[PDB]
Amino acid sequence: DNMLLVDDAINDDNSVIAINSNTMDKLELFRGDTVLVKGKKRKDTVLIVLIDDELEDGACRINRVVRNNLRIRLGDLVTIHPCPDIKYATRISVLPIADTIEGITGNLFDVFLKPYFVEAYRPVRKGDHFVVRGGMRQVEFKVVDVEPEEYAVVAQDTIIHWEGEPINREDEENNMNEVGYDDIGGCRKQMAQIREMVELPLRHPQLFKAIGIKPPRGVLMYGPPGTGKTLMARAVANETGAFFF
Amino acid sequence: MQIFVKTLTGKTITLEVESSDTIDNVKSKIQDKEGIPPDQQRLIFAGKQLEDGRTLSDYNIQKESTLHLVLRLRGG
Amino acid sequence: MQIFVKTLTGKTITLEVESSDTIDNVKSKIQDKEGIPPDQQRLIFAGKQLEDGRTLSDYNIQKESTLHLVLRL
Amino acid sequence: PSVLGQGSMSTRIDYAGIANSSRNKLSKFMKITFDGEPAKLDLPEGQLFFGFPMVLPKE
Amino acid sequence: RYGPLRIKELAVDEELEKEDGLIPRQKSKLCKHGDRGMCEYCSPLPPWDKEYHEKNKIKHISFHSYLKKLNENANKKENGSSYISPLSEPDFRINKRCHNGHEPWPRGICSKCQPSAITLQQQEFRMVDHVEFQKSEIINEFIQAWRYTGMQRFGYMYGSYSKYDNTPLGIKAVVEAIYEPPQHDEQDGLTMDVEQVKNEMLQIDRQAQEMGLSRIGLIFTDLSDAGAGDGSVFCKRHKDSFFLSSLEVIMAARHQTRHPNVSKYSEQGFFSSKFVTCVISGNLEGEIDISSYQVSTEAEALVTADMISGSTFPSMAYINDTTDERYVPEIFYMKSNEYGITVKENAKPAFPVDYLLVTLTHGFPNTDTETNSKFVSSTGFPWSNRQAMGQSQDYQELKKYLFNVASSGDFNLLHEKISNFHLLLYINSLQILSPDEWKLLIESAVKNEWEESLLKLVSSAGWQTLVMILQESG
Ligand SMILES: Nc1ncnc2c1ncn2[C@@H]1O[C@H](COP(=O)(O)OP(=O)(O)O)[C@@H](O)[C@H]1O
Ligand SMILES: [Zn+2]
Ligand SMILES: [Zn+2]
């Protein structure tokens, strides 16, 4: 139904997703509608729906940047939901990526972002990546803060704060937390045990209310050092999306 | 015509009179509603010593107009 | 009749005095009540130090009004 | 002068009285000094007392 | 909150937090290494270095530097935690809702909601460092009140905060004007109804905020003239005797709790109000030098749950007893004996208050440097609540003060006679002027580049009516 197939969008816009007419009819969506798209690792974004009949029924087209943000690859499935209660961004504070701004003279904002958002109404969410192609250069950016939170539409009157120091790229990669089950192999049994002992108490509390038991609290993992206990715990916590501490 | 009048202390009241009508009429109205002899009533607006012998026409004063009241005795 | 007076200590007193007697009578009332002679006290209302030669009617002191007291020998 | 322990607000509140009562503090059916123990001297909010008997420096 | 809390505080705090305060050091003669690379003595000195302070005669560590110390001590980046907030104000009120199985406090209490023993110890960070008076007239007139009358005084002081380079990441409170509430002053003390005083101060504070000021402390005089022919006063307050009696400390703590300092690094978002209290008593000589103090954070949170009261001994604060709705645990004040050993002495009967204070340093701006005074005033129109003296604000005073200059011109003279605090407040109370008219009045009186604004003011109708009534009044 809403599990639209992922495809490489022809356009490079960071807030546009092309869908087939049949799917548009199935979900009652329409061209220009802003919808919430969720992929993998609970990643979410807001995209403007556009009708495009070239795609096969049940397939949607998104660009490289959106796929990277959602942490999903081509051929995956994305769930699309209505996003009617999105307000216009009162103030968006954004800083560029240092490596992408090397050798840029003059005001970066006026050169690149000033025409990108004006008369665009692009919905932006915190932690997303958007890329602007200006002149002979292409620069990626980050949505550091959006008011109202956590996401909003960048209107013409929206105030954009580009002041701030460059953001290093290495932070995102070398700090590669939010690691899913795809980074762990050969320990499916213990991973399943931890999942059944952690996720269900948190993700579906009503089960134990219906049965009427107090779920167990403590869990003690042990084994030889260097077997990835910390990695397993981190992966489970990130997959659950809970307040890991 | 609707008008506002504020006393020395700050009490504010609303009165009605025709613009072309002489300000003497408004002074007499205020007096009769507060027993203030005409001489005891001095009306001020934009630093002007308003006097009974005129109307609101000559002072370019219309509806929604605010005036101040003072006693000619020695001050407030 | 009913008047209010801000004292020197910083409080307000409600005094009963008819509006048809000289302010000198009010001064006598206050000074007798608290014992501070009126030979030095002065009254203040609307920035108009009230001269002792006139009564309440001249100023048309409305009921439940308010004045201030100051000291000057 | 009188402001050395015996003035205004020292007679409204019996500071000497408090000190003497603390001295002879018993069921039992003037001078003010600091030879003894303190006794709870409580005043309502908005009152400051500067009338404590002065002490002067070591000289 | 997955990171730092989001909240807005003063600009001074923001700019301070921007900096780092690292104190550079050069190659010591004790280093053994090449030019590059630093061993242990060439490393930059942290802003909170205790040795540097006591070597420079600085007694407390400039709270912002304390925040830097706490952030460095913990909160590793990118891992290790989820940002446990570093600062938290003390709270001694017993949790009325704990319920391990026990009932509320009055009839039941477990070992988890029992206020543990409180260990008093002299504070080390002073929120506000240097209290600075723009013009000596501000306090000279205040003392002049006592000079004429002989009774004591008390007044709140308005102003604003700013940086203070002389101390690592330090703050100064610049006081622009003093406002006197209605008090029933006496010889040995003073009295003022709290309710009426706060009611008046609410609107006075609103107007001051409209002017850009803010309430940053209270100043009172403890002055008693000696028998000397010239002006000499006994020094009742020094190391031998008390600095601030128990009652003054209690009042300062109440005021501090009633003006919280909004901060971004606490669970509640506020911590250790910036509210300096100053006292005038006279140094060992006959001078009338002033001082400054600020009650420590514990005393701030120790008096919210009652637990302290004044005592007949000036330098000691009496302790209350237990009862329903008020649980008071044992109090230990920890000092250091002459042999350099910390000693805990139980003080239920009474304890000195010197463990509930932190000292500041008063001063005046250099008399040959830039003058950014908002008000060239403090010698003119009588101040607000000086009814006891001959002073009395009224129409004839305004006529005698600002009629000859107003009727002729001298826009420089008009400006210098129009930027007075109390005069502005009084004419505002007059209500002769409209809202935006008064806004332009204040913008002309309390700002530079004031030509066109004053011209607009005079050109207005309200000012014309005001001068007309002034002329009418004797
Ligand atoms: N599937 C995996 N199973 C075990 N170790 C893994 C796996 N994937 C990666 N590793 C590596 O094994 C190490 C696991 O470290 P770990 O033993 O969890 O540390 P700790 O001592 O904190 O428990 C890391 O170097 C990690 O990169
Ligand atoms: Zn070295
Ligand atoms: Zn409990």
Numbering used by the authors:
A (entry chain C): 33 to 277
B (entry chain K): 201 to 276
C (entry chain J): 101 to 173
D (entry chain H): 230 to 258, 281 to 310
E (entry chain G): 107 to 580
Question: What wording appears in the published article?
Answer:
In substrate-interacting and ubiquitin-unfolded classes, all but one D1 domain is bound to ATP, while all D2 domains were bound to adenosine diphosphate (ADP). While the atomic models built for substrate-interacting states only had ubiquitin in UBS1-A (intA, intB), analysis of the EM density for substrate-interacting state intC suggests that ubiquitin can occupy UBS1-B prior to ubiquitin unfolding. With the β1–β2 loop coordinated at this site, ubiquitin occupies at least two states, UBS1-A (akin to “Ubprox” in the structure of Ufd1/Npl4 in association with K48-linked di-ubiquitin, here shown within the context of the full complex with Cdc48) or UBS1-B [akin to “Ub1” in a structure of the full complex in association with a polyubiquitin-modified substrate (28)]. Distances between distal ubiquitin bound to UBS2 and Lys48 of ubiquitin bound to UBS1-A and UBS1-B are consistent with a covalent bond between these K48-linked ubiquitin molecules, although densities for the linkage were only observed between ubiquitin molecules bound at UBS1-A and UBS2. UBS2 helix interactions with ubiquitin were observed previously and include interactions between the hydrophobic patch around Ile44 of ubiquitin and UBS2 residues Met574 and Ile575, and polar interactions between ubiquitin residues Arg42 and Arg72 with Glu578 (28, 37). Other major differences observed between resolved substrate-interacting and ubiquitin-unfolded classes are the orientation of the tower relative to Cdc48 and the positioning of Npl4 residues 437 to 451, which forms a loop atop the Cdc48 central pore where substrate enters the hexamer during unfolding. In unbound and substrate-bound states, this loop is positioned over the central pore where it could clash with substrate as its being unfolded. In ubiquitin-unfolded states, the Npl4 tower appears perpendicular to the hexamer plane, but in unbound and substrate-bound states, the Ufd1/Npl4 tower tilts back and away from the Cdc48 central pore.
